[PDB]
Design a protein around this ligand. Structure first.
Ligand SMILES: NC(=O)c1ccc[n+]([C@@H]2O[C@H](COP(=O)([O-])OP(=O)(O)OC[C@H]3O[C@@H](n4cnc5c(N)ncnc54)[C@H](OP(=O)(O)O)[C@@H]3O)[C@@H](O)[C@H]2O)c1
Ligand SMILES: NC(=O)c1ccc[n+]([C@@H]2O[C@H](COP(=O)([O-])OP(=O)(O)OC[C@H]3O[C@@H](n4cnc5c(N)ncnc54)[C@H](OP(=O)(O)O)[C@@H]3O)[C@@H](O)[C@H]2O)c1
Ligand SMILES: NC(=O)c1ccc[n+]([C@@H]2O[C@H](COP(=O)([O-])OP(=O)(O)OC[C@H]3O[C@@H](n4cnc5c(N)ncnc54)[C@H](OP(=O)(O)O)[C@@H]3O)[C@@H](O)[C@H]2O)c1
Ligand SMILES: NC(=O)c1ccc[n+]([C@@H]2O[C@H](COP(=O)([O-])OP(=O)(O)OC[C@H]3O[C@@H](n4cnc5c(N)ncnc54)[C@H](OP(=O)(O)O)[C@@H]3O)[C@@H](O)[C@H]2O)c1
Ligand SMILES: Cc1ccc(CC2(C)C(=O)CCC2=O)cc1
Ligand SMILES: Cc1ccc(CC2(C)C(=O)CCC2=O)cc1
Lengths: 258, 253, 260, 252
């Protein structure tokens, strides 16, 4: 069936919440067995797992802090040990930071890069090691990587610039087990990371999340916000057999937003 | 069992859909449950075989002859399209021509032969799609990995013609906003068609065999490798990809 | 000590009677190059620019030529070598702006814009290759609205220029066989009549405000809180067409001030 | 006209390669120059002498630009010694070769610590110490985006960060009229280049074959890169701001 992952096994970093959980649920709905990674949210992780079973697929929830390379090896090893194999691996887990360059401390740089940049690099490494031939790797970026220059968004933005460079090359290295590497580069997607940002990137903590959401709904010429489900559908296609001939590319899923 | 990206009750139009990538897109949209207008200019034989193929898998279709180099023919194309199927939801600009030659030997005639179809015709094919399309609709334009990624010698004219398209789709996506119509491009790499064979010179299948190893996946691009990306984009699920050139080259260098 | 001068060199700038072309031409003159000031409709300003270049101690001429007519481009490049003996540098600067929603764009309008902005630039670049000294320089002019900024009702202009970008990448390869560099400059918000006619539309109400008012408003858009001036682009161009600019070859440079 | 009289510039790793070319070029153009080394004081001394030789002043300052504390001292001592600083070139980098499967946490940390994190904080300390209307230059690679070389994923990543950095840095440094740009060198003949012509014969034999990458049929030398930095950091380069300039002479 076009678009489906029946008999495929997937892993998603940070799939208890946000775009993570919509991806896991969508791969599940598409036919794949889902390994749902969290670090701080076992409760929402279990809801995602149960939601996937309710629709007919299988899922488990493994805790692992993807800032820790040993916990990533354990994450993938345990994935393989439980479902038998891994076809698909979506590096989703990341954090936002906001600040003028003059006020960025070492501690803020390392927090962001450990997860966004370094953590995803090793999620990709262990993905290649653990993946069936024909498999899929997805990494997660930002339209603030190349397309939008928000002031005081340097640290986060470069953390993702590094992801764009990695995928192009990764798709070369990974071709030797016929694994395709792409990133998705979401724009404003309604999650707690979006609401934490809109507050700092609008003249401005005095507006309800609802109203910053309505303001940003205008940036899109479709007159709406992006949603986890929007980015999930694009990851779904990429990780299908039909999305094969997209390789080494970065897809921006923002809606034509300005 | 959930079936993604299906186009039942939708009508698609695909310029240049009797031969090559176009024919694969027409059929692919036909497989995903779209009624299809198959445009041709010179290949009525081929266009009919395409119309046939799409009825075969249980969707409706018609061939329409039209020179997308002629704006009056573009108007009449989209008119007949709406006359027959009563609506159009998806318009795909595929029709294109290749050119090869050092800037020094390029003529006014050769520039105009290429930009007439691959740039101007595509822009008016999109203008008529915006006017004839329904809200929630889909415009898809065709480019080339040569537009920006790859700098192949003696390929200026052609890569020019498509670089215009990359700019068009970004701005169009804002314009087509007021009918909630999304505009994107597919930028194919070397895809196995008559055109690829025409310019694998710069043993049709021997030169093909060379090109298999440019992609890390060690195989050529085939017309259906692009069709399936068009399929996702002109689905509901593709909506949040907008004003974006997708390069479909397999990772080719 | 004295970097990126153009002494002994000859340059041709298209549409160097007004705006960017004029300051480009003056800059290359400032830098020691003799300058062919092309124009199509502005012959008196073309002469003021020649006199300004002559006045700062170089030589220059004004040649009428419509870069929409290719034989007028061949004739332009012929006359320029006939008059100065040679040509090292060729700046494709001539273009027009168009505002309009796809729905309202006409054949006559599309052709108006593409014939000067694209076809024209292409053939300036063709005759430049043919007429130019080895080690020479070709520059074409794009816009930051070609890839960087997506502005509504700006499809036709933006596309006319996106072609320009693709062209300079491949032109660099073709033109390599005479050790000629081809780059482009993408200006963004440069105070000229083109900018004033564009601020009218891309501004909350537009004609309600003087052109200075709209200008003063655009100044905030830049991290350097000022507008772009033609001199800002002429400076980048002067580097590119210098001997020292050589290892920039095949790129589009965006000279917008870091602006949005 | 492109000159730097009364200006002071700092160049990280300007003892060797592109750096020294840049340090020597900013001197040629009238800048006084702080020459930063971490490992190579003997070359650093050569560069200071050369800049004294052509009629500008200079000083060598040891600082490992992996330690942020040593970046702080370097910039403090620079404003100490010359009593201002206009221009700051983040140059110091390293190269890494390996399939994604083979890359270790220690290699990534050796690469990012200097190429990405180090440069990030040189730019912070550049902005904190720099005069108004000043210049920050950072350093990438045509491998960040334009070219995709098997087994180059770490180096390219390290430098793709940099491209995003300079874009936003240009906005933040807009309160002190400071422009921020990266040059993205291609194959430039230095100690790092001979290192990976091997992995990707004699050096001269690998240089001769690399000369054909460019449509100008030349391999690329420090002076090529240094010229473009000289322009960006001159008054005339002001309108180039927030941009990645790829100096590969059109190569490959
Ligand atoms: N506007 C946007 O939403 C937007 C835009 C561009 C890019 N992105 C990217 O899209 C991806 C998803 O973000 P989101 O918006 O969904 O954000 P989100 O709601 O903040 O969710 C963050 C996710 O990251 C996980 N996570 C955090 N720290 C972790 C750690 N040390 N180890 C493992 N997992 C960790 C969280 O799980 P725990 O709860 O288990 O910690 C959570 O699942 C991110 O990579 C983000 O950078 C988002
Ligand atoms: N390597 C590749 O295949 C490749 C790579 C990059 C981009 N592309 C692009 O993909 C598109 C399809 O090309 P292809 O590769 O499939 O080429 P192809 O085999 O040459 O097919 C050309 C198609 O264009 C139609 N066409 C030609 N002139 C026309 C006109 N005046 N009016 C209407 N239709 C016309 C043809 O129909 P008639 O025969 O009936 O005229 C035919 O269906 C083109 O835009 C091309 O630039 C292809
Ligand atoms: N200003 C901006 O903000 C901006 C932004 C992006 C790009 N640009 C580009 O910058 C370049 C110059 O723009 P501008 O702003 O300086 O424009 P401008 O003030 O409008 O001047 C237009 C120039 O075009 C020349 N021109 C027009 N038609 C011509 C023809 N048939 N043949 C020869 N020359 C012709 C004009 O000369 P005549 O009077 O002699 O006809 C004049 O020199 C153009 O390439 C433009 O697209 C400008
Ligand atoms: N060379 C190329 O072909 C090429 C291509 C693309 C990009 N680049 C970039 O160009 C820049 C210059 O490279 P290159 O080719 O000149 O390389 P190079 O020959 O290897 O030179 C290395 C320079 O880096 C300095 N350095 C190294 N580690 C340092 C540290 N911890 N702290 C301070 N300084 C340090 C060195 O100083 P000590 O010896 O004193 O340590 C030396 O001056 C680099 O950023 C590189 O990534 C180069
Ligand atoms: C060096 C080279 C040049 C052209 C092709 C084929 C193809 C696909 C393009 O890349 C543009 C259009 C077209 O025919 C393949 C390899
Ligand atoms: C944010 C923005 C950037 C560019 C434009 C168009 C452009 C490039 C022109 O051609 C006229 C002036 C000018 O800014 C409009 C708005």
């Amino acid at each position: 069936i076009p678009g489906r992952l029946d008999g495929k096994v997937a892993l998603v970093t940070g799939s208890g919440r946000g775009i993570g959980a919509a991806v896991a649920v969508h791969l599940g709905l598409l036919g794949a067995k889902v390994v749902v990674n969290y670090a701080n949210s076992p409760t929402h992780a279990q809801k995602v797992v149960d939601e996937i079973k309710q629709l007919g697929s299988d899922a488990i929830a493994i805790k692992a802090d993807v800032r820790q390379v040993p916990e990533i090896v354990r994450l993938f090893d345990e994935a393989v040990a439980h479902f038998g194999q891994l076809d698909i691996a979506v590096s989703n887990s990341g954090v936002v930071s906001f600040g003028h360059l003059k006020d960025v401390t070492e501690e803020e740089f390392d927090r962001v890069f450990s997860l966004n940049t370094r953590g995803q690099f090793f999620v990709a490494r262990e993905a290649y090691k653990h993946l069936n031939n024909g498999g899929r790797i997805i990494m997660t970026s930002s339209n603030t990587s190349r397309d939008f220059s928000v002031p005081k968004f340097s640290l986060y933005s470069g953390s993702k610039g590094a992801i764009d460079s990695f995928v192009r090359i990764f798709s070369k290295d990974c071709g030797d087990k016929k694994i395709t590497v792409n990133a998705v580069a979401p724009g404003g997607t309604v999650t707690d990371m979006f609401h934490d940002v809109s507050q700092h990137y609008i003249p401005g903590e005095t507006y309800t999340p609802e109203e910053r959401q309505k303001m940003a709904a205008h940036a899109s010429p479709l007159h709406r916000n992006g949603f986890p489900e929007d980015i999930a559908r694009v990851v779904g296609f990429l990780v299908s057999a039909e999305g094969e001939w997209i390789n080494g590319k970065v897809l921006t899923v923002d809606g034509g937003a300005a």
